[PDB]
Design a protein around this nucleic acid. Structure first.
Lengths: 92, 81, 96, 92, 95, 94, 81, 91
DNA sequence: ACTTTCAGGGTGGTATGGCCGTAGGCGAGCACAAGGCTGACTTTTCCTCCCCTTGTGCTGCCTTCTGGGGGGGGCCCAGCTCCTCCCCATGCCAGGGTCTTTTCCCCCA
DNA sequence: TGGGGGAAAAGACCCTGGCATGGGGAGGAGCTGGGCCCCCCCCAGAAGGCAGCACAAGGGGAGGAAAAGTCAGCCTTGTGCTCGCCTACGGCCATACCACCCTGAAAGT
């Protein structure tokens, strides 16, 4: 019952490096990385909601939290990937 | 909309250095302290403007500046919080 | 005609005894608005926001100059140099 | 249909939604926030994995190891900025 | 019964009730215990008393009567523990 | 719209610790920021503690552990003692 | 017991310095590095043991160490989180 | 004197193994923890994580120390370099 | 491979948040000095940089031995899990006590 | 000599008391995973010693580049006035998310 992103990280490795495997130790580092960035974005989006006295974390707060934490080029691409998914999700 | 980093005059940089305890100052210190100040101000102002844009505001506020400074481990007292 | 250094020590004592801003306000306001121009056009600023920015900037510069003086004394010098500022920044983690 | 396969993401939108709701971040969580966070996490993991796979290929290896992850992180400038105060176990 | 303030019941001067309200509204946990506001208010009041005593000593050194940011900064920078606790904090008009 | 601050209580503690010394408005506004910063630090550390231990309640034990984690040395010692004394007084008087 | 700081031998300190990039090493560097390592370990272990005692446990856990390092600004990837 | 130093830097910068011996590091960690709580047990993973963190910390400190040494027109690192690096870092 | 929890469909409800209106605080803008601050020049002198020498400590290499690393086994203690229940925290409403906003005037700066 | 802070008054708002109630965790058992302890061994690295050499440190010289003083100008700043724009509150209503019940599937074993 101990969940992890080890199932979903594997499916993204088979899309960029289909012929390359991942060790057991390195795959646990991948989980500590995802669990770190998620808490970073959710800890800044929870501050933007408090500053503006809002009780809801929407995609607008996650967008700003990504913009405040990630560096220059990563934030330009991570935001674009986020808004493409939300648009596709809402549209059927 | 013009060179405003030259408005951080040499006497001001010497005053800051002497507040820092510096005894003698090389003549190339000024143009480099100006760039350091520019980088720091760019970081803080970018964070403050991101907060302002998220808040759907047009004026950058002291509380936005305080949040921007706190986000860098540079908490500032006396302007709110 | 005072000897080279006694006036410098007097300035050090005077500027460590006071609490006022050592950077003129109008040029700093102009520089802040200049920098914010490239982030967002037609941006207004609170006087308290400009005040907080100036206070933080001057505290940061005083601390950086103290570290620069430490670096200069490390190399058996009394004159701080751009190499001293670069070493201080690299060690604290601003130049990597 | 699973919420991931309505906008085309490999990361679990439902799991991220539950994590945000249970994470003590706000009294409410929107409906596009998990999608946006899943997209951002997927993009970051994909970028890091691609660079680590490039590093592993440079070392004539078919497995991702902490050494390759550290090499990718320290080589890429933006990743070096983001994970600048992060230690990788057995990463050299 | 008579509305006795929980601050008076605990013997503190800080607002135990307001601290409880901020802890509940701050989104820190699903629930907040009954001793958390009482403990936090006591800690905050002790730290305030320490910093204000040192600021008053600093003001008395300078032959003043009213504490100003300079006295607070002097107290913090001259106290080893308070310097460690606040060693990333900038004080406005503190020098 | 009425804003809230710890000014009244800071003034009461100042009167108790220094009978005749006053305080300026800038100093009071700095003290309010100090109190808010310490409160947010302790609350965040206690929330992280309760999440690490899979608990849904922030209690005196969590606040004491957060104080021990954040405050240095004798500051932490005396703050923990003050908190324990206050909690004992509160729960010893209904 | 006592006298275990010497377990960080001089060759180990030289290997760590060579990993850092050091070319030549002075003789007092070994004692200074031992003191520095001792201070770092006391800080991290104090935080980890506080985290362990909060859980009413008697075993210092890799998670306890990870949290102690995280609350000092040094995140560690590999042992969980 | 120095070519072996270069061919030691090139060897221990390319490898990832721990540089300190596990048994004395374990004994030192337990000796330190004894002053915080008596009769403490330790997970092997916990001690290993402590070792990785300590080694990374010391490698970074030695990088900053080497920078301080080159600042003073020297190739030999001295305790003054470590002290300056730590003071500038804020420790 | 099996499976067990947990993500998703469906339905109700309301509380958060978006939209429009509005009015004032305050941020931008323009004069107007004027004088304190800044910029440019000059002397000089003291600091920094280069060179030379020396001795002192660092490094490289040999040899010995010791203690750390790798298993092998035991055991027993502490961490994890399950079932009770009860006591603590939450949700809601009334009423009053405390904390916020406005005026001032006299003592500290 | 002046200006702002310490006291006083009105009010408004939220804190406390009271009542009903679901659920979290404290506790009592059980169980077993691994942390500690002992044992053997052996050989890889730590330690000590010696040679030598190269590197840091001290002294001396030179030149060059900040410091200190001076003078003229300039542009910051404090005050005054205007405008109008943005922001904060209020009133209202839509719909988005939560809450909960069932079912199948997916991911962890």
């Amino acid at each position: 019952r101990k969940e992890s992103y080890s199932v979903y990280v594997y499916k993204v490795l088979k899309q960029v490096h289909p012929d390359t495997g991942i060790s057991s130790k390195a795959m646990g580092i991948m989980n500590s990385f995802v669990n770190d960035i998620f808490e970073r974005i959710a800890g800044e989006a929870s501050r933007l909601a408090h500053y503006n006295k809002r009780s809801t974390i929407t995609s607008r707060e996650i967008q700003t939290a990504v913009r405040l934490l990630l560096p220059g080029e990563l934030a330009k691409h991570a935001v674009s990937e986020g808004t493409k998914a939300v648009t596709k999700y809402t549209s059927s | 909309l013009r060179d405003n980093i030259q408005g951080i005059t040499k006497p001001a940089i010497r005053r800051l250095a002497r507040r820092g305890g510096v005894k003698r100052i090389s003549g190339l210190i000024y143009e480099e302290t100006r760039g350091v100040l520019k980088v720091f101000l760019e970081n803080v102002i970018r964070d403050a403007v991101t907060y302002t844009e998220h808040a759907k505001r047009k004026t950058v506020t002291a509380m936005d500046v305080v949040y921007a400074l706190k986000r860098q481990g540079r908490t500032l007292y006396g302007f709110g919080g | 005609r005072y000897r080279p250094g006694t006036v410098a020590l007097r300035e050090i004592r005077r500027y460590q005894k006071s609490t006022e801003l050592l950077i003129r306000k109008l040029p700093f306001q102009r520089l802040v608005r200049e920098i914010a121009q490239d982030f967002k056009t037609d941006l207004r600023f609170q006087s308290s926001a400009v005040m907080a920015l100036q206070e933080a900037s001057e505290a940061y510069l005083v601390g950086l100059f103290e570290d620069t003086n430490l670096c200069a004394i490390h190399a058996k010098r009394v004159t701080i140099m751009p190499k001293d500022i670069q070493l201080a920044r690299r060690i604290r983690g601003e130049r990597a | 249909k699973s919420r991931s396969s309505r906008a085309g993401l490999q990361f679990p939108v439902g799991r991220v939604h539950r994590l945000l709701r249970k994470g003590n971040y706000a009294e409410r969580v929107g409906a596009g926030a998990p999608v946006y966070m899943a997209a951002v996490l997927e993009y970051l993991t994909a970028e890091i994995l691609e660079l680590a796979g490039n590093a592993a290929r440079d070392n004539k290896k078919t497995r991702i190891i902490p050494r390759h992850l550290q090499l990718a992180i320290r080589n890429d400038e933006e990743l070096n900025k983001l994970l600048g105060k992060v230690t990788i176990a057995q990463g050299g």
